[PDB]
Design a protein around this nucleic acid. Structure first.
Ligand SMILES: [K+]
Ligand SMILES: [K+]
Ligand SMILES: [Mg+2]
Ligand SMILES: [Mg+2]
Ligand SMILES: [Mg+2]
Ligand SMILES: [Mg+2]
Ligand SMILES: [Mg+2]
Ligand SMILES: [Mg+2]
Ligand SMILES: [Mg+2]
Ligand SMILES: [Mg+2]
Ligand SMILES: [Mg+2]
Ligand SMILES: [Mg+2]
Ligand SMILES: [Mg+2]
Ligand SMILES: [Mg+2]
Ligand code: NA
Ligand code: NA
Ligand code: NA
Lengths: 50, 49, 203, 117, 61, 53, 83
RNA sequence: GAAGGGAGGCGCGGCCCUUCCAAGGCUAAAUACGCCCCGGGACCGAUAGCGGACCAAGUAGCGCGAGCGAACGGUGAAAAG
RNA sequence: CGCGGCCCGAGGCGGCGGGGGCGACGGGCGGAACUUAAGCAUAUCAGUACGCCCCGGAGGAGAAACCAACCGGGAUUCCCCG
């Protein structure tokens, strides 16, 4: 909604900042086999419950 | 807001899910280390004697 | 001999003088709260016999309890199992009213150590007891060899583990010999020892 | 468990050298009619036996004798048997003063098991 | 911070009550415990008895 | 081992076998089910030693 | 039974054989500052009217033990027959 | 509702014998045992073994909620890919 | 009507204590039913599951208001035996 508490707003803020891929220089520095971050979410499919 | 935590023996899976050791346990780790290999016992002996 | 005179006097509860004094006391207690601190013991000689001393760290509290039997806690008074477990109102508590007073006081004052208790009055709906308590961190207590033993951490909440005289009597520990061989060091411990399946290497 | 019990015994024996691990204890009869004619080891000597050897409970406990003031003698044969036992033990016991040099203490032998079976 | 702590600690060197941040490091359980001499205290009668019969060294055979 | 899940039998009338199932419908518990317990699990109370005169 | 048959029992050994005014004063003083309990006065009246078996029944009902009851009756008989 | 009292594996009353002293308190040892650390095994060997051998498991995901709960091991001597 | 002692109470200040956590072992309470009896109601399962409270490195118990009936033993705990 457009009328939220700051407490709910801060927990949703962290979810957005975390929805990122694995950086390219990290994949090769650590010699990673699996190159996708499976803790990502999509707004049309998820239920954050926050 | 009950003072005590909600724990039930008819589910050991939920106890398993949230309990001591599922977090960092910073203070307990430090005290256990200072005791097994450290000077906590010497300090206690000096303080008591 | 003063305390001998007091003891013989207190053996005559039905005399006119003691009857009058008991009536006065029971009226007085009926106007107060169910747990109350006392300035000094009401019965000095009995308190001395139970271990009380007149120094800093000893305190006395008066406790009131209700008389009669117990009623089960089940909705609408319905037990549902087999017919032998069907009773509601005719039951009797497994512990005495003297032992329940110490539990109430210990719950109310968790920072003190319970010692003993004694009877002081009854009136037909209540009984009154007095409980002796010790402050384990007062220096006079901590530096006295005669009472030091109660400063140990194993003396924490003695009444909650049936270790006072009344709890010990309810556990059956005032008896020895024939009739008492299945209850030491506790009922469950004896039951466990008598039902263990020992499987030795060279059976 | 066997190994652990032996280790504890050895440590304790080392801590009190050269005193023996066990104390001298009386000779008593087995109770019922089925074991009437044999003896075993008892708890402690009575005060009459100690008076027979002229000793006190404090001294007896000092030189390693077990004392049981709860037990009462029921006949003179028991008293005689246990007085003789005490006399033998006293004949065979040696005391070291705080003035003895360390060497002769090292020469002492520490007894094993029951004192006199 | 180290300099400030040293100064403050020198300020309360010999007082009866010092700030709780300077008291010796122990656990809760060992803080709330009897000292060693308090555990060894005996009533006078037992003291007298235990002095007239001290432990002695002896050997058998 | 094999008994830490929650599984109950569906009845007849759904066109499936009558063994216990997990919430999604996965078979459980039986010794012929993947992840189940042993039919007769081994125990330490077996007699390991023997006596000789 | 309860004992083993033996015509010469205990013939091998020789056996050994084992084995307040201030209280009365204190009791007498307390008896003056207090009387007798209500159930003792009833027993005294019964003893005064010459009804001994009635007194024993009453005391036994009150005390619950026959030996204690007879002791109590003997104790109280002085205050009844002394008149 | 008391003064000497208790016990002796069938009750009541009487007389003996044998044993002990309740209604106050303290006390080491020999005994039990998970987490965590160390050692071993005629144990399992990736649908087995713990639900969980995989840089992210009580994780992803499901349910208003109490709860439920997976799948996924292997290039080569050297990436010389 | 004022003020001193004792007694019984009230408000504040200082210094010390308490509270909560721990799928084992330990103590105290409350307390089932499935099941067996080829049915079932006393009995059994079981003084168990589970709920509540309380310590410790162990706990609890403990120096006879004991056993016994003998040519007697002698605080408590734990093992073997029936
Ligand atoms: K699985
Ligand atoms: K039962
Ligand atoms: Mg105790
Ligand atoms: Mg499996
Ligand atoms: Mg008999
Ligand atoms: Mg112990
Ligand atoms: Mg697997
Ligand atoms: Mg305050
Ligand atoms: Mg069953
Ligand atoms: Mg049936
Ligand atoms: Mg059937
Ligand atoms: Mg049926
Ligand atoms: Mg049963
Ligand atoms: Mg203890
Ligand atoms: Na394979
Ligand atoms: Na608590
Ligand atoms: Na602890």
């Amino acid at each position: 909604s457009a009328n939220k508490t700051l407490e709910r707003k801060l927990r949703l803020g962290k979810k957005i900042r975390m929805n990122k891929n694995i950086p390219r220089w990290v994949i090769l520095k650590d010699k990673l086999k699996k190159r996708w971050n499976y803790k990502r979410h999509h707004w049309r499919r998820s239920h954050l419950k926050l | 807001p009950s003072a005590k935590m909600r724990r039930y023996n008819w589910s050991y899976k939920s106890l398993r899910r949230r309990t001591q050791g599922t977090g960092s346990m910073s203070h307990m780790r430090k005290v256990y280390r200072a005791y097994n290999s450290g000077t906590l016992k010497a300090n206690a002996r000096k303080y008591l004697a | 001999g003063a305390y001998k005179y007091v003891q013989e006097l207190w053996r005559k509860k039905q005399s006119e003088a003691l009857h009058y004094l008991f009536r006065l006391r029971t009226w007085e207690y009926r106007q107060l709260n169910a747990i109350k601190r006392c300035s000094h013991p009401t019965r000095p000689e009995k308190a001395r016999r139970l271990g009380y001393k007149a120094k800093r760290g000893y305190v006395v509290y008066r406790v009131r309890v209700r008389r009669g039997g117990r009623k089960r806690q089940c909705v609408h008074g319905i037990s549902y199992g087999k017919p032998r477990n069907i009773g509601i109102v005719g039951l009797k508590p497994s512990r005495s009213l003297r032992a329940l007073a110490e539990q109430k006081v210990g719950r109310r004052l968790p920072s003190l150590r319970v010692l003993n208790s004694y009877w002081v009055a009854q009136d037909g709906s209540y009984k009154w007891y007095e409980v002796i308590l010790i402050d384990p961190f007062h220096p006079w207590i901590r530096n006295d060899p005669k009472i030091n033993w109660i400063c140990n951490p194993v003396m924490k909440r003695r009444e909650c583990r049936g270790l006072t005289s009344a709890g010990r009597k309810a556990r059956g520990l005032h008896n020895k010999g024939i009739g008492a061989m299945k209850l030491r060091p506790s009922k469950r411990a004896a039951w466990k020892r008598n039902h263990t399946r020992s499987l030795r290497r060279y059976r | 468990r066997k190994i652990r019990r032996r280790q504890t015994r050895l440590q304790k024996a080392k801590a009190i050298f050269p005193c023996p691990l066990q104390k001298l204890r009386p000779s008593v009869t087995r109770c019922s009619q089925k074991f009437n004619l044999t003896q075993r080891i008892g708890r402690g000597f009575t005060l009459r036996e100690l008076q027979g050897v002229g000793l006190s409970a404090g001294k007896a406990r000092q030189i390693g004798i077990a004392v049981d003031p709860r037990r009462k003698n029921k006949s003179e044969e028991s008293v005689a048997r246990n007085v003789a036992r005490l006399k033998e033990y006293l004949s065979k016991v040696t005391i070291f003063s705080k003035q003895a040099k360390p060497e002769e203490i090292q020469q002492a032998i520490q007894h094993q098991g029951v004192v006199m079976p | 911070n180290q300099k400030a702590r040293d100064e403050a600690r020198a300020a309360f060197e010999g007082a009866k009550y010092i700030p709780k941040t300077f008291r010796p490091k122990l656990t809760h359980a060992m803080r709330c415990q009897l000292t060693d001499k308090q555990k060894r205290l005996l009533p006078n009668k037992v003291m007298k008895r235990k002095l007239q019969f001290p432990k002695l060294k002896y050997a058998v055979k | 081992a094999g008994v830490q899940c929650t599984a109950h039998s569906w009845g007849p009338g759904r066109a499936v076998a009558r063994l216990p199932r997990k919430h999604g419908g996965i078979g459980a518990y039986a010794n012929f089910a993947r992840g189940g317990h042993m039919a007769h699990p081994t125990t330490v109370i077996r007699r390991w030693c023997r006596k000789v005169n | 039974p309860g004992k083993v048959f033996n015509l010469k029992k205990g013939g091998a050994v020789v056996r050994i054989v084992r084995k307040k005014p201030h209280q009365e004063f204190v009791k007498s003083i307390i008896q003056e500052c207090t009387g007798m309990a209500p159930y003792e006065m009833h027993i005294i009246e019964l003893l005064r009217m010459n009804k001994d078996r009635h007194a024993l029944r009453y005391a036994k009902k009150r005390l619950g033990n026959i030996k204690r009851a007879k002791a109590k009756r003997d104790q109280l008989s002085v205050y009844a027959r002394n008149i």
